[PDB]
Amino acid sequence: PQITLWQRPLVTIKIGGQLKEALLDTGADDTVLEEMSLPGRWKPKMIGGIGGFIKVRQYDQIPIEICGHKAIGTVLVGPTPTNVIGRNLLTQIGCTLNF
Amino acid sequence: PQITLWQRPLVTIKIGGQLKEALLDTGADDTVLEEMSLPGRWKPKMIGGIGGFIKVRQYDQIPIEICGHKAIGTVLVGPTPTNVIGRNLLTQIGCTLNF
Numbered sequence: 605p606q607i608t609l610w611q612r613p614l615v616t617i618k619i620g621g622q623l624k625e626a627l628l629d630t631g632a633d634d635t636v637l638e639e640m641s642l643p644g645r646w647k648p649k650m651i652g653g654i655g656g657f658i659k660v661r662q663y664d665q666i667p668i669e670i671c672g673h674k675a676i677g678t679v680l681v682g683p684t685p686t687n688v689i690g691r692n693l694l695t696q697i698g699c700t701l702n703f
Numbered sequence: 704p705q706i707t708l709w710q711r712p713l714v715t716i717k718i719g720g721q722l723k724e725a726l727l728d729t730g731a732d733d734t735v736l737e738e739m740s741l742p743g744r745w746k747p748k749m750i751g752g753i754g755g756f757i758k759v760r761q762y763d764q765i766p767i768e769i770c771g772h773k774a775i776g777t778v779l780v781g782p783t784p785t786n787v788i789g790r791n792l793l794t795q796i797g798c799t800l801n802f
């Protein structure tokens with residue numbers, strides 16, 4: 605699709621069998637989701653946003669659908685204001701910015 | 704142009720007589736720049752991201768030039784850790800997401 609930006613670029617993702625809404629965010633290196641259960645072991649990451657730093661749990665090699673486009677990659681989980689899909693997964697689904 | 708998301712999508716903007724580098728951010732409602740001077744009236748605003756909120760000055764109807772594209776919009780100024788161009792200006796230069 606071509607998504608314009610008059611509204612928040614909110615899409616439906618699927619992860620661990622469940623549908624969620626997330627924000628397509630080209631200003632984010634990483635993908636960070638609100639608290640949820642994921643399988644396997646996790647590593648620590650500190651990520652910085654506009655308001656400061658938060659600790660998150662890093663899960664790797666997690667399958668995730670993003671408006672129906674299949675990706676498998678690194679998902680961070682922690683206290684974010686919303687689910688944000690970052691460049692690590694945007695690149696996997698062939699996203700570019702165009703003007 | 705078409706802009707890849709292998710790297711951070713950084714562009715030069717011209718604003719208030721100054722050249723600055725900034726991050727094209729589809730996930731951002733607003734445009735926020737590190738501390739600088741702008742002319743005319745302003746009002747305080749709290750904006751939120753990962754980490755919490757910061758207090759900024761809101762200037763409206765500010766001319767800006769992005770990758771050679773002229774627009775005019777609200778610009779927020781404050782202690783953001785990096786310069787972000789948000790949807791309020793991205794729309795004006797015809798910027799869309801594509802995959």
Ligand SMILES: COC(=O)N[C@H](C(=O)NN(CCC[C@@]1(O)Cc2ccc(cc2)C/C=C\CNC(=O)[C@H](C(C)C)NC1=O)Cc1ccc([C@H]2C=S=CC2)cc1)C(C)(C)C
Pocket residue numbers: 627629631632633634635636651652653654656685686688690728729730731732733735750751752753784785787789
């Ligand atoms: C490389 O680090 C990152 O990629 N950080 C990422 C990130 O914060 N990058 N930044 C882009 C802005 C992120 C976000 O779009 C993320 C976002 C957060 C909340 C919301 C939407 C989008 C919804 C709630 C309120 C609306 N808030 C906003 O629209 C704000 C804008 C007003 C700034 N939007 C955002 O803050 C800008 C940003 C970049 C770097 C840094 C850091 C550099 S050093 C310490 C921090 C801070 C901010 C992230 C998401 C992984 C934490």
Ligand SMILES: [Cl-]
Pocket residue numbers: 676677678692693
């Ligand atoms: Cl990844």
Ligand SMILES: [Cl-]
Pocket residue numbers: 775776777791792
């Ligand atoms: Cl505006």
Ligand SMILES: [Cl-]
Pocket residue numbers: 608797
């Ligand atoms: Cl349009």
